[PDB]
Design an enzyme around this catalytic site. Structure first.
Site, mmCIF file in Angstrom:
data_model
loop_
_atom_site.group_PDB
_atom_site.id
_atom_site.type_symbol
_atom_site.label_atom_id
_atom_site.label_comp_id
_atom_site.label_asym_id
_atom_site.label_seq_id
_atom_site.Cartn_x
_atom_site.Cartn_y
_atom_site.Cartn_z
ATOM 1 N N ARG A 62 0.810 -1.213 0.000
ATOM 2 C CA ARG A 62 0.000 0.000 0.000
ATOM 3 C C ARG A 62 0.847 1.268 0.000
ATOM 4 O O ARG A 62 0.376 2.334 -0.400
ATOM 5 C CB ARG A 62 -0.981 -0.028 1.164
ATOM 6 C CG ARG A 62 -2.164 -0.957 0.878
ATOM 7 C CD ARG A 62 -2.517 -1.832 2.057
ATOM 8 N NE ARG A 62 -2.878 -1.045 3.223
ATOM 9 C CZ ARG A 62 -3.181 -1.553 4.411
ATOM 10 N NH1 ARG A 62 -3.169 -2.868 4.603
ATOM 11 N NH2 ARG A 62 -3.497 -0.735 5.410
ATOM 12 N N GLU A 99 1.168 -5.557 13.140
ATOM 13 C CA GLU A 99 -0.117 -5.828 13.801
ATOM 14 C C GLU A 99 -0.814 -7.173 13.572
ATOM 15 O O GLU A 99 -1.335 -7.759 14.521
ATOM 16 C CB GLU A 99 -1.123 -4.706 13.515
ATOM 17 C CG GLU A 99 -2.293 -4.695 14.512
ATOM 18 C CD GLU A 99 -3.447 -3.807 14.080
ATOM 19 O OE1 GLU A 99 -4.016 -4.063 13.000
ATOM 20 O OE2 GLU A 99 -3.790 -2.859 14.818
HETATM 21 O O1 LIG Z 1 2.739 -0.206 12.044
HETATM 22 P P1 LIG Z 1 2.665 -1.691 11.703
HETATM 23 O O2 LIG Z 1 2.040 -2.477 12.854
HETATM 24 O O3 LIG Z 1 3.987 -2.283 11.232
HETATM 25 O O4 LIG Z 1 1.566 -1.920 10.550
HETATM 26 C C1 LIG Z 1 1.467 -1.092 9.397
HETATM 27 C C2 LIG Z 1 1.735 -1.720 8.210
HETATM 28 O O5 LIG Z 1 0.874 -2.931 7.968
HETATM 29 C C3 LIG Z 1 0.124 -2.797 6.780
HETATM 30 O O6 LIG Z 1 0.770 -3.430 5.638
HETATM 31 P P2 LIG Z 1 0.655 -5.018 5.369
HETATM 32 O O7 LIG Z 1 1.751 -5.691 6.114
HETATM 33 O O8 LIG Z 1 -0.733 -5.450 5.702
HETATM 34 O O9 LIG Z 1 0.984 -5.095 3.801
HETATM 35 P P3 LIG Z 1 0.137 -4.515 2.508
HETATM 36 O O10 LIG Z 1 0.625 -3.122 2.314
HETATM 37 O O11 LIG Z 1 0.489 -5.410 1.344
HETATM 38 O O12 LIG Z 1 -1.345 -4.556 2.918
HETATM 39 C C4 LIG Z 1 0.112 -1.278 6.500
HETATM 40 O O13 LIG Z 1 -0.058 -1.053 5.097
HETATM 41 C C5 LIG Z 1 1.458 -0.816 7.040
HETATM 42 O O14 LIG Z 1 2.456 -0.992 6.013
HETATM 43 N N1 LIG Z 2 -6.071 -1.150 11.685
HETATM 44 C C1 LIG Z 2 -5.397 -1.155 10.627
HETATM 45 N N2 LIG Z 2 -5.958 -0.584 9.471
HETATM 46 C C2 LIG Z 2 -5.363 -0.501 8.215
HETATM 47 N N3 LIG Z 2 -4.134 -0.983 7.984
HETATM 48 C C3 LIG Z 2 -3.557 -1.546 9.094
HETATM 49 C C4 LIG Z 2 -2.286 -2.115 9.111
HETATM 50 C C5 LIG Z 2 -2.085 -2.560 10.403
HETATM 51 N N4 LIG Z 2 -3.165 -2.294 11.174
HETATM 52 C C6 LIG Z 2 -4.089 -1.661 10.368
HETATM 53 MG MG LIG Z 3 1.874 -2.278 3.979
#
Ligand SMILES: O=P(O)(O)OC[C@H]1O[C@H](OP(=O)(O)OP(=O)(O)O)[C@H](O)[C@@H]1O
Ligand SMILES: Nc1ncnc2cc[nH]c12
Ligand SMILES: [Mg+2]
Ligand SMILES: O=P(O)(O)OC[C@H]1O[C@H](OP(=O)(O)OP(=O)(O)O)[C@H](O)[C@@H]1O
Ligand SMILES: Nc1ncnc2cc[nH]c12
Ligand SMILES: [Mg+2]
Lengths: 179, 179
Positions: A62, A99
């Site tokens: 993302r 997360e």
């Molecule tokens: O602050 P954090 O707890 O590290 O979480 C945040 C990250 O997690 C999600 O990505 P995800 O790992 O779901 O990958 P994506 O972008 O492919 O959805 C979001 O897009 C952030 O990059």
């Molecule tokens: N609550 C939340 N919403 C969207 N993206 C993320 C990625 C980690 N936690 C999330």
């Molecule tokens: Mg991500």
């Protein structure tokens, strides 16, 4: 013309996603609404107007959407930090936890970053801060100087205090929207 | 100022990646070099100047980088087509196969597309054409009219004749670079 607050009003909160317990913040309508995407872009570009950024580093996946937009708007190259096994050539690696997933591994091509760079690390959401902390390590291992890293996120979930976490490695953190 | 040909000259060919047998075309240096990214962007935006595109649909994940850039440049919203299990809310789905992976499933949020849209489906590389063919099906199931889909890719590997394959569903295909 839409404002940043208007963009904020487009975010959807989906309960129990991707698993029950996690309240997913869906920013998709901001990206699909031109006036909203512009408002957010302008906020980022204006914030770094006096910063000699040389590269935008966006996090798979993302972090790629507004990541490329911001790089192109600032007139600097875009560098992809992605999930292990995807980037060809010499790469630096770092494994972390976020997360809703443990044991993640991100990589970056060695040749794309170095000591001369001033990096704008960008990601869409700051939750715990694990992805970004791991991201800062990647850039530093690639040669980027600690004082030359800036972080930007579209949305910050202040609840999980990721800013403090990421703060151990970088305190130049700008978030367009705070929950 | 760099030209599209200059951008083409930045592509690296990595043999045996991600597995031996597949010659990976690494377009990363185009994205990290501002003059090259601009040249490619301008080529895309100029090509659709007289087309009433309403949405850019980019394919996870490399399709996100120039995907958002092009949407923002054209002044239209960006819609993400991504790997199953990632998008919250109501979604349309479609399973397909690409050059180095069988059983892939892509999804799109129902609310992001409909009959009023004129879509610019964008992805970075056209290999066999399976990802895009599956992408066209997704948009159509979401309500987009067949005559209202346009396809753009940064790089086209004419060897695997994906244009003919995708041609069964869409013949408005513009590729910035052909191998
Ligand atoms: O602050 P954090 O707890 O590290 O979480 C945040 C990250 O997690 C999600 O990505 P995800 O790992 O779901 O990958 P994506 O972008 O492919 O959805 C979001 O897009 C952030 O990059
Ligand atoms: N609550 C939340 N919403 C969207 N993206 C993320 C990625 C980690 N936690 C999330
Ligand atoms: Mg991500
Ligand atoms: O013409 P095809 O044979 O369908 O192959 C092309 C597609 O495969 C690659 O994506 P990949 O599935 O590797 O996902 P990624 O963007 O996350 O690398 C590439 O980025 C195209 O999207
Ligand atoms: N040879 C190739 N190079 C880069 N991306 C892809 C995606 C499928 N085949 C590829
Ligand atoms: Mg892809």
């Amino acid at each position: 013309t839409m404002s940043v607050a208007d963009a904020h009003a487009l975010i959807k909160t989906i309960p129990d996603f991707p698993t029950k317990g996690i309240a997913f913040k869906d920013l998709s309508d901001i990206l699909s609404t031109p006036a909203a995407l512009d408002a957010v872009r302008k906020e980022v570009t204006a914030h770094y107007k006096d910063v000699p950024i040389t590269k935008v580093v966006g996090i798979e996946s993302r972090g790629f959407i507004l990541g490329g937009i911001v790089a192109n708007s600032l007139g600097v190259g875009f560098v992809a930090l992605r999930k292990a096994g995807k980037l060809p050539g010499d790469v630096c690696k770092c494994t972390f936890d976020m997360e809703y997933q443990k044991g993640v591994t991100i990589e970056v091509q060695k040749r794309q970053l170095g000591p001369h760079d001033v990096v704008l690390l960008h990601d869409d959401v700051l939750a715990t801060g694990g992805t970004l902390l791991a991201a800062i390590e990647l850039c530093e291992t690639a040669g980027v100087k600690p004082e030359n890293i800036y972080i930007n996120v579209l949305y910050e979930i202040e609840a999980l205090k990721g800013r403090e976490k990421v703060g151990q490695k970088c305190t130049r953190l700008f978030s367009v929207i705070r929950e």
